[PDB]
């Protein structure tokens, strides 16, 4: 039930049913894989299944976060012992950033944390770009130029 | 050994299926054109179109005086350090210009010279001349290989 902002009871009943199904299915696949390993047959590892809940979201960015975690659980090596994973009603748990995301800088932040930088003529152009981009890297920037409005 | 350590690092840093991310084509001596073609076909079969060509393979050279240098050593140094670069450039250029993107990076050395400024480097004329030849090849093929393919 990606459906949100209304509250659902059929959603809860579906969540309980699917969670029980996932639990019993994981147990089935696990013991089946041990049976196969005892038989020595090269068989696929146990089926790993999980559930992602969304109704418990009041915000807009819940769908993208849920899709990102869906891809994360699908593609990576990550395992989660619990079957049901709810989404917090307000995404104020890891900074904010909307789409965080990764694009246009993640290789950049933290490279110059702890430094102090004074740049001259940073009103616009290359000076503004270097000041801003180094500021995102974690240093403290001291923008000096003539026109006050462009600086602010 | 290098591949094992690299894949260990990749597995540690969170990547998945390291065995499909680092392949080896050892036993390919840069001094043979046929071995260069074999390396090209192996890389094409393994990963398809190749974007980055990091030509780093290079030996010290004859390690003698110019007046004590046999011509066969001169030819071997030119083949290993200069000819192979254009050979691999020729074999890898068609794909990069077909897909509209590409980059070849040749490992030069400071002791070979610079534009409008040469640098002596005794006992080692072959290395210097070959290295400056690599630099010249890059600086002159930048025009014709562009804008699809970079050279540096």
């Amino acid at each position: 039930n990606g459906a949100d902002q209304n509250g659902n009871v059929y959603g809860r009943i579906q969540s309980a049913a699917i969670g029980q199904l996932i639990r019993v299915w994981r147990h089935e696949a696990e013991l089946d894989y041990q049976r196969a390993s005892a038989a020595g047959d090269h068989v696929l590892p146990p089926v790993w299944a999980n559930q992602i809940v969304r109704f418990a979201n009041r915000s807009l960015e819940g769908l993208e976060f849920a899709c990102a975690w869906t891809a994360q659980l699908l593609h990576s090596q990550r395992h989660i012992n619990e079957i049901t994973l709810n989404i917090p009603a307000n995404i104020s748990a890891t900074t904010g950033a909307r789409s965080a995301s990764v694009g246009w800088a993640e290789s950049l932040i933290g490279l110059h944390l702890g430094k102090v930088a004074l740049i001259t003529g940073g009103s616009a152009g290359i000076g503004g770009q270097i000041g801003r981009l180094l500021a995102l890297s974690g240093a403290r920037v001291m923008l000096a130029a003539r026109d006050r409005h462009k600086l602010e | 050994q290098m591949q094992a350590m690299i894949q260990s690092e990749l597995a540690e840093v969170g990547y998945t299926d390291v065995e499909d991310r680092v392949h080896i084509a050892p036993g390919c001596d840069v001094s043979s054109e046929a071995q260069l073609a074999d390396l090209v076909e192996r890389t094409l079969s393994a990963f398809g179109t190749v974007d980055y060509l990091i030509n780093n393979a290079g030996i010290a050279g004859v390690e003698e005086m110019v007046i004590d240098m046999p011509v066969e050593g001169w030819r071997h140094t030119l083949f290993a350090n200069l000819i192979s670069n254009y050979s691999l450039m020729r074999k890898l250029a068609p794909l990069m210009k077909k897909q509209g993107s590409g980059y070849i990076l040749n490992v030069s050395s400071y002791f070979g010279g610079e534009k409008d400024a040469a640098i002596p480097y005794p006992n080692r004329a072959d290395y210097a001349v070959s290295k400056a030849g690599q630099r010249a090849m890059a600086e002159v093929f930048a025009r014709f290989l562009g804008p699809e393919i970079q050279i540096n």
Partner: protein, 152 residues
């Protein structure tokens, strides 16, 4: 008063059509209690464990064969899940299956006016079955999608 089964929250093998609808029934019981609170009808749920019967013995043997385990391991496990001992016919304390009379006494408790202040609660006639009530978490950190490779 609805009689559900405790195995709706345990590792209960080979019986999805038996376990899933009962968990859905528990959720329906909670929601129906909420809705019928307004109209003034009391709703109560009971969780009887493995009750003394021939059918449950056949069920345990079936689980034993389907798991590929010797007979009695299912009984030993679910009896280990208990905490309580009751005096047997000879007065000795042992771990044994709860009887139908206990469930009937609890049900007549819930039905009668003596249980007026109870609404949507759950009582377990289980001799102390210790099972995980639920397995739930929340996703409080954003996804790291840079290292994810989904080729092929």
């Amino acid at each position: 008063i609805n009689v559900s089964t405790i195995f709706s929250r345990a590792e209960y093998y080979g019986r999805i059509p038996y376990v899933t609808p009962k968990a859905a029934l528990n959720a329906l019981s909670q929601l129906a209690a909420r809705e019928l609170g307004a109209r003034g009808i009391r709703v109560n749920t009971i969780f009887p464990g493995p009750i003394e019967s021939d059918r449950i013995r056949t069920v345990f043997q079936r689980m034993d064969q389907l798991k590929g385990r010797p007979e009695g391991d299912t009984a030993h496990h679910f009896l280990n899940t208990m905490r309580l001992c009751r005096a047997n016919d000879q007065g000795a304390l042992e771990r044994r299956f709860p009887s139908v009379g206990d469930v009937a006494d609890a049900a007549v408790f819930l039905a009668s006016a003596e249980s007026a202040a109870l609404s949507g609660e759950t009582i377990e006639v289980t001799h102390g079955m210790e099972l995980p009530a639920c397995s739930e978490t929340s996703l409080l950190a954003r996804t790291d999608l840079r290292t994810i490779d989904a080729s092929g």
